[PDB]
Amino acid sequence: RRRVIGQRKILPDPKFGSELLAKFVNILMVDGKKSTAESIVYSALETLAQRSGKSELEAFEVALENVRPTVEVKSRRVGGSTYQVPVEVRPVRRNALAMRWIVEAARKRGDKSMALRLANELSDAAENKGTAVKKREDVHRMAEANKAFA
Amino acid sequence: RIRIRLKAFDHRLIDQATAEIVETAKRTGAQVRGPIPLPTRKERFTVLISPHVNKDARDQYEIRTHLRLVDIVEPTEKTVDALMRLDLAAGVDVQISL
Amino acid sequence: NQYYGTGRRKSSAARVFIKPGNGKIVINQRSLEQYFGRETARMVVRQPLELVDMVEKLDLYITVKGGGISGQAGAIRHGITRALMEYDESLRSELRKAGFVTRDARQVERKKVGLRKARRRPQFSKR
Amino acid sequence: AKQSMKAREVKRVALADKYFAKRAELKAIISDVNASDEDRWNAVLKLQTLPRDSSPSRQRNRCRQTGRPHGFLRKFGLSRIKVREAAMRGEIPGLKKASW
Amino acid sequence: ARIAGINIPDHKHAVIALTSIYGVGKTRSKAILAAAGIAEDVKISELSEGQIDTLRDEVAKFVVEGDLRREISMSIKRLMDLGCYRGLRHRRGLPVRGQRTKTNARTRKGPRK
Amino acid sequence: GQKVHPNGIRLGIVKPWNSTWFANTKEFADNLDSDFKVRQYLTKELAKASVSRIVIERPAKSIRVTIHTARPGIVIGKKGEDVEKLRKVVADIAGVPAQINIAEVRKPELDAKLVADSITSQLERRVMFRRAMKRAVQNAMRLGAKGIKVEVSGRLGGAEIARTEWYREGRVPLHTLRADIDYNTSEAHTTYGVIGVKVWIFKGEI
RNA sequence: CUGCAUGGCUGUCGUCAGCUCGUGUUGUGAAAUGUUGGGUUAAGUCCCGCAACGAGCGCAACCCUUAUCCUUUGUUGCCAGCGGUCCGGCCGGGAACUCAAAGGAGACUGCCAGUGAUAAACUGGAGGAAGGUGGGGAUGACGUCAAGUCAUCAUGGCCCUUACGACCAGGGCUACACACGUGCUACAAUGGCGCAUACAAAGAGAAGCGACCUCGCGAGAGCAAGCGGACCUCAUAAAGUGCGUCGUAGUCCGGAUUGGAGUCUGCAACUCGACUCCAUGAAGUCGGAAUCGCUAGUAAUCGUGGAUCAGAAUGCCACGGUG
RNA sequence: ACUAUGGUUUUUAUU
């Protein structure tokens, strides 16, 4: 209730020209295994090599334009009642949410291997259907069933 | 030519002991070789505060130990006689073996 | 004329030496390009050298011992900086603006009593 | 702690001045394996199976002020439950409460 | 299925393919191959290439199934009516190397409801 | 619950220890036991010698003791022969030739060990402890104290009551390390319990 | 036996800001005012104010540790210059530097800008190695739970003493009508195994650690160096990386159960020990109502020591790696 | 701020 902090500023990679590689290697990272992270980083662009489009330098960051986060749901309690609100995503954190939603299927699906799960889910990217899409699609229901908040 | 092994449990003690050994060694040799400081040794302990209960409570204690060597570069043995006719700071051990 | 710099991180220590005139990039007798061949910290040693453009104008020598490899890398960034800020005093302010000249504060914490895994507390649910 | 226990512990210090001369060598003699189905100690084996406090087992340092069976620490030469008394009385050289 | 013996696995590592059928140990399951020049690599599923149709008698010429059971039951052949420790602990389904029966006992009698 | 000895807790202010001897760890339990052997005998034989403190020192095959008393004339005597007897018997349990130094106390009724004697002996004499303690407190503030607490525990006057009683004067810090408090704890026993006393004396900050 | 009869000794809220005394005022008094209010704080902290004026204890600091520059120096640690010199911190030597020890300096919201009561203070800025509590640790006031200990010591009462003793040969305290907590490993593919290889800290070590070397499938045993501390030994740290290989297969995985054969301590090991090598082998493919830990070198997660001790910990403490 | 809601915790020791 009184500790006040901020955010750490990060630089674009000298090879990849993007700020995505500066943060995305810390996402899906576990047990301090950052060399495993540097070994699965965009490794689905080989399982998607026939569906990658022009320039593999941007061929993963273009997917965030189809991950397209719009709202995040917060749930808190006032008195006895727990309530839920869909709020619009914030000007820098909108990119962090896209970076979180893009790895929802990376283990929690039957396809085997991270790269194949991710390439299959990056090919469901336009419609967003079936498994691993709950946190992406069902958050939007709350913002289309209600447009009168304070 | 000999080292005088000086041992203590305190820095200002081992130094104020040294301070009369290097003063004796100038009275019995005109000059001295000067300092030898050494890395200071330290041990830690975590001791139980309860005889049988409270296994997750342990208090944090140290034992620090000091050593000095002096090093005598005059072969005249005049300091190793005077070292055994010297009022020295209390709480130290002194040894010599040529 | 030779320049020198000290650097420290996570109890590890670096001794870095710089000379004018193009040449080597040495670390524990090995190449700086190859010693950090895959290491996650491989750009950390490069950031201050890039700021003058590397392997085209000066000669670099490094000695490092003990601790971690990301530790030795983060110590080297300060050691390079401490020599480079005397080799180019026009860069002394650029290195302050990049923060590479400040002492690394990421020292390791110690195990607590009543705890097993550093500072993860043994769990308790109910009486 | 039992008075008959310290009696045995004190006699064990005098045992170290009468047993390690030759009886510890007789214990080695009757523990040898090299000979088979031939007698060499037939009348003197019962004269060496009797001594038993000379065994390496069943010994603890014990507290020299409370006879306590357990709680010893070789770094202190003192039973653990008597350290907090000594460290407040100043009775162990070099020992200090610090934290770090 | 059931090509190496009584056990059902379809595709199995060749150096242990004779395990879990009562006739071969873990090292013997690899030694039995090198006495006949049989390959110690790649999983097997059928009676192809001589890889296991050559091993039928080399397993059966030793204690197997009930003959192996009878040999590891020599421990109790003097205890087939005398109950002294191992005797009673074999005349009924019971532990012989200590059992902390107040936990970890489902495996001795049957699974929890 | 109360915790830690009010003077023993201050040894962490780089203070020296009550004995200084050197020996390798494999003989440390017996080299420490020799220290108890002399300290316990010397305290037992100085229990009524008006002694305020005892310090031991054990140089190489030597022993050097320093004791403080308000009345050296009951420790030395007969052209030094009455302490030459004490020198003989301490060497008999130390296993080394001895030296014995006797220091003379000034303002003894300001020292926590001798202020504790002033109440412990009178508690054994069944004296009215509230008066005896009040005088001991005011006399300390007369002689040189800047604050004092004397605290009695258990069977107060032989009664079926436990608790504690003290009545504090001046200022006595608790958790300030520059305070240097002079402390003691005693027992008077008699026939019905243990009947304990504690004392804290403050003289000014270091 | 009784710590709800006690001295001594040790928890917990909490390291929370709280507990009191003198004086002046108030109320019949308990007691309030003070110590509440306002701004602010890590805080009865720091400013402001009012019938309250001051003081004592706790609180900040003093204890412990560590981060930097400047200067001088050093062993068995170091090696920039210099002599010797295959070239080797090796010898001579140096105390430049990692490190070590001492000497000195540095930090104060001091400086800028808003906010705010032109205060205190916060947030932001500048300079600085360090900034607002620098990072990380002792320290427990006055109270609560009549906390816990007659199982250290001491002790009032009570009890056993033709005993329940403790000498000796020996038992039980690793007995299960059933579940949970703790510790832990697999179900793996972001994996595991073998082989190679990068980057360690800390500590223990004279009936010890035990090298080289020999023997024993191995545990272990023998010959036997050095070391008592920066000597010589435990001891090439493992995850990480690289090749090969597995590919839902109740798996190379994982081994409960279990039989034999060796090793080791001991007067004696089967029960209720450890270590090793074989042969035999079930479960585990994902988890119910529910629950837990960390704010940063932290959570993650693999390695390495220490105590106890005839012989044997997975429990206790302690130190690194990636992060 | 206000969930839509729930009944009940043996006794006793600072004299």
Relevant terms:
part of a larger assembly, 6 chains, B: 98 residues, alpha+beta, four-stranded antiparallel beta sheet, F: 206 residues, five-stranded antiparallel beta sheet, 4 helices, globular, RNA-binding, ribonucleoprotein (chain A), tRNA-binding (chain A), mRNA binding (chain A), rRNA-binding (chain A)
Blueprint of the fold:
This is part of a larger assembly, with chains A (150 residues), B (98 residues), C (127 residues), D (100 residues), E (113 residues) and F (206 residues).
Chain A: H1 20-23, H2 34-40, H3 64-67, E1 71-78, E2 81-88, H4 93-101, H5 114-121, H6 134-144
Antiparallel strand pairs in A: 1-2
Chain D: H1 3-15, H2 23-29, H3 46-49, E1 72-73, E2 78-79, H4 83-89, E3 95-97
Antiparallel strand pairs in D: 1-2
Chain F: H1 28-45, E1 51-55, E2 63-69, H2 81-94, E3 98-104, H3 112-124, H4 129-143, E4 147-153, E5 164-165, E6 169-170, E7 182-187, E8 196-202
Parallel strand pairs in F: 2-3
Antiparallel strand pairs in F: 1-2, 4-5, 4-6, 4-8, 7-8
Chain C binds two RNA strands through strand 1, strand 2, strand 5 and helix 3.
Can I get a quick summary?
Chain C has 127 residues and is of the alpha+beta class.
Describe this structure in words.
Chain D: Part of the 30S ribosomal subunit. Contacts proteins S3 and S10. Chain D: It holds the Pfam family Ribosomal_S14. Chain D: Keywords: Ribonucleoprotein, Ribosomal protein. Chain D: Belongs to the universal ribosomal protein uS14 family. This is part of a larger assembly, with chains A (150 residues), B (98 residues), C (127 residues), D (100 residues), E (113 residues) and F (206 residues). Chain D contains four helices and three strands. Chain D is mostly helical and 100 residues long. Chain D has one domain (1-90). In chain D, strands 1-2 form a two-stranded antiparallel sheet. Chain F has helices at residues 28-45, 81-94, 112-124, 129-143; strands at residues 51-55, 63-69, 98-104, 147-153, 164-165, 169-170, 182-187, 196-202. In chain F, strand 7 and strand 8 (196-202) form a beta hairpin. In chain F, helix 3 runs antiparallel to helix 4. Chain C binds two RNA strands through residues 2, 4, 6, 8, 10-15, 17, 35, 37-40, 63-72, 96, 101-103, 105-111, 113, 116-126.
